[PDB]
Design a protein that fits this description.
13 helices, adenosylmethionine-8-amino-7-oxononanoate transaminase activity (chain A), binds the ligand O=C1CCc2cc(N3CCN(C(=O)c4ccc5c(c4)OCO5)CC3)ccc21, homodimer, 7-stranded mixed β-sheet, 2 domains, Aspartate Aminotransferase, domain 2, about 425 residues, 4-stranded mixed β-sheet, binds pyridoxal-5'-phosphate, EC 2.6.1.62 (chain A), Aspartate Aminotransferase, domain 1, alpha/beta
Chain lengths: ~425, ~425
């Protein structure tokens, strides 16, 4: 047991944080002591305070924290089987989850590879695509193509398709694989961007295993939205040039953008698809890669005879059990109305920010609201300002944004957006 | 789902570790429960109890469903399932980091939490690369190892895995090209160390780090080597200014007779990975540790941070049960317990030496190996061990076990008796 000052002291000396230093942190982390529903209990000046988790703890807590259906599923599975190795064994929570995932994902995705994080599931997708083409006698098809502004994780193959500027690729000269980058995909649809994407793809087709993109919403690389018709063009280009299509739905999955999967906004099925952040409802680390029967059978008939990947905790019974409950909980309610109501609350609550002087754009897509500013947001100002108004907000670069839990009441959504407007206002003064 | 429905769902939709879809020689076995050292499997449609001789792939060091660990999980479930580690810290993370810093080899003072072993290896490599970039030497970007190793399934991890075990022939022109020394021998030979140093010397200017499994190489062949080899590496790396990374993801937490296998040699790496047994086999979690010198140099360099941060970084649920698992090991006389297990393994497997198809039998801590002159046929071995109440999963030519630390002498004699029989069926056909 540690007091908050003991925690801060341990943390300052021994704990790395995401994309952080040791010893050169401008602002200390805030101690978290509880989380229930949409609310975090944080320690501010020795005093516990309840604030709204407007970030859904980094896209994860779609049902809020400590939801009874998900707590219950965890403890139930813990009573019977915490974990067993997946090599040579199978179990009910894997079979239930996989049956769920093949049924609700874009059509044709019929096999499920479980792993422990989004980055790994992206590497697994790349491995599927590479082994698929080696199973076709075309080992030269080993590069990847994407469009700028994307983010696909932090392991070294995942990095190679992240936005070169956003992903600081200048720091990894002669280290990252050299992939093919198309220009930033625009917000509005423009058949000339698609024509130039195809023209660029056409000169790399024989060395391309796959096109890899986030569908409709690009997260960590800029919180940018783009017209779903672009994904329809990508599906057509990939079909005609025989390059596999891979959708990274690790951020967009499970209703977050107003459709169950963001690919549903275009009616597109990728050959391969990754899911992750909201898969467990924010309880535990879990991720999944799905492919079509065609990909699976080509890999399985190739010279390797198998997919050469196998995480230690593959298909962990506990993680799968809570994921089964989170997915069932979501499908058991009218999630699309819920998301629509969240979107309209974000849109209504954020409109006033458009007239703020340092604000260049406001945009909402499903349960995602973005205030885009004209200068980088100072976290040392923004974070305590939002805590002062009862909201946990985490700006990044010039963006003040929220992806709040689906269980947020309309009054709670208005409290979130109000704190976002006031952060935006402080930015410009 | 019934067992028959599980197997049907599984065969259609579920990938397994290093497996095919639709071409599996043998169906997986349905696991329905796991408690203590025992799994409950479905054979002939009926639940049977068998010993988890593999500790569920090195994980279940305290057995499944240990009441102390179940209760640590449920306790933390009541308070906080998860919050984001960007901008927040919490007591499970501080408690675990303080434990890990104090029990690991001297000098490892900072902890980077991730969700799997392969990710923790990529983090260590990223640590080493950013270290040398922060020292002005970006040319130091390659890794060196000895053959026979395994470090995970992500693409950078793959690049330092044994080329044959890791089937690098399938990956020509894909993997980063690393520096391999010959297989490290079992018995200590100073000429091996001189040849490693001479090879490293001509690469020292382009090498960021040596990466090895200390004492025991796992998935690459279950081979053991004299710890004096690790003393030699610490000296070579020190003198040639190349970082030393120990991969303790399978050897950690008492498995080889010392708390960490580095302690057999009395040396500290600069960077250290741990993972498989960290949570007592409950949940996915891993950690990468580095010295203060590495952390300060990364943080003072041009990037000013470590460019990594997974979504579920430092997950409260996984950290809580890991704190309980670690303190549970430390709160008993684990060194005697492992010594008793090693003796039980040696006494039980001795008779295998006489079998006509056995070329070696070796034990190291809670690890026992029978190496055969032929490959072990899983279609014969797995039912043969099942019929004797033991779950064994041979690999290539190896019949081996890594039993839970809670195994009684009668359970060990039962496991080893099963292992001897599998080897007897090998030299028969
Ligand atoms: O709380 C958490 C858990 C994961 C996390 C990542 C965080 N991010 C902050 C740093 N990030 C980045 O700057 C970043 C890295 C690579 C990129 C990128 C952005 O765009 C394209 O490629 C992305 C990760 C912040 C907080 C948290
Ligand atoms: O039950 C599980 C969880 C993870 C797992 C890996 C398993 N292994 C089966 C196949 N393996 C291998 O053949 C293997 C792969 C890469 C290598 C290697 C061996 O030596 C150097 O590089 C190692 C992975 C088997 C079962 C299970
Ligand atoms: C967060 C994210 C990842 C990485 O997942 P981790 O669990 O952090 O490894 C990959 N792709 C996308 C689109 C993401 O949003
Ligand atoms: C199992 C293992 C890994 C990879 O861990 P995962 O959790 O399966 O990704 C890495 N290194 C070593 C030595 C291992 O034994």
């Amino acid at each position: 047991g540690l007091t908050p000052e003991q925690i801060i002291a341990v943390d300052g000396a021994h704990l790395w944080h995401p994309y952080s230093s040791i010893g050169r942190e401008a602002v200390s982390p805030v101690v978290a002591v509880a989380a229930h529903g949409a609310w975090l209990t944080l320690i501010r000046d020795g005093q516990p305070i309840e604030v709204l988790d407007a970030m859904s703890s980094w896209w994860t807590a779609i049902h809020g924290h400590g939801h009874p259906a998900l707590d219950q599923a965890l403890t139930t599975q813990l009573r019977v089987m915490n974990h067993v190795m997946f090599g040579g064994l199978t179990h009910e929570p894997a079979a239930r989850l996989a049956k769920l995932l093949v049924d609700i994902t874009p059509a044709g995705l019929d096999t499920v590879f479980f792993s422990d994080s989004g980055s790994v599931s992206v590497e697994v997708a790349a491995k599927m695509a590479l082994q698929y083409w080696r199973g076709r006698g075309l080992p030269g098809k080993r590069r990847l193509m994407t469009w700028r502004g994307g983010y696909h994780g932090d392991t070294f193959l995942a990095m190679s398709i992240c936005d070169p500027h956003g992903g600081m690729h200048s720091l990894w000269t002669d280290v990252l694989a050299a992939q093919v980058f198309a220009p930033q995909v625009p917000r509005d649809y423009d058949p000339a961007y698609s024509a130039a994407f195809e023209a660029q793809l056409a000169q790399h087709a024989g060395e391309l295993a796959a096109v890899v993109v986030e569908p409709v919403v690009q997260g960590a690389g800029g919180m940018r939205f783009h017209d779903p018709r672009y994904l329809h063009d990508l599906r057509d280009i990939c079909r005609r040039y025989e390059v596999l299509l891979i959708f990274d739905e690790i951020a967009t999955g499970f209703g977050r953008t107003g459709a169950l999967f963001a690919a549903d906004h275009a009616g597109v099925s990728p050959d391969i698809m990754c899911v992750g952040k909201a898969l467990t409802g924010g309880y535990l680390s879990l991720a999944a890669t799905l492919c079509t029967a065609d990909v699976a059978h080509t890999i399985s008939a190739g010279a390797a005879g198998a997919l050469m990947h196998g995480p230690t905790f593959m298909a962990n019974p506990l993680a799968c059990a809570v994921s089964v409950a989170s997915v069932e909980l979501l499908l058991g309610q009218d999630w699309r109305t819920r998301i629509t109501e969240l979107a309209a609350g974000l849109t209504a609550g954020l409109d006033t920010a458009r007239a703020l002087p340092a604000v260049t754009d406001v945009r909402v897509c499903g349960a995602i609201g973005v205030i885009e500013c004209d200068r980088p947001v100072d976290l040392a100002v923004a974070t305590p300002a939002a805590l002062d108004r009862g909201v946990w907000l985490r700006p990044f670069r010039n963006l003040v944004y929220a992806m709040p839990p689906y269980i947020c009441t309309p009054a709670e959504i208005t409290q979130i957006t109000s704190a976002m407007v006031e952060v935006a206002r402080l930015v410009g003064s």
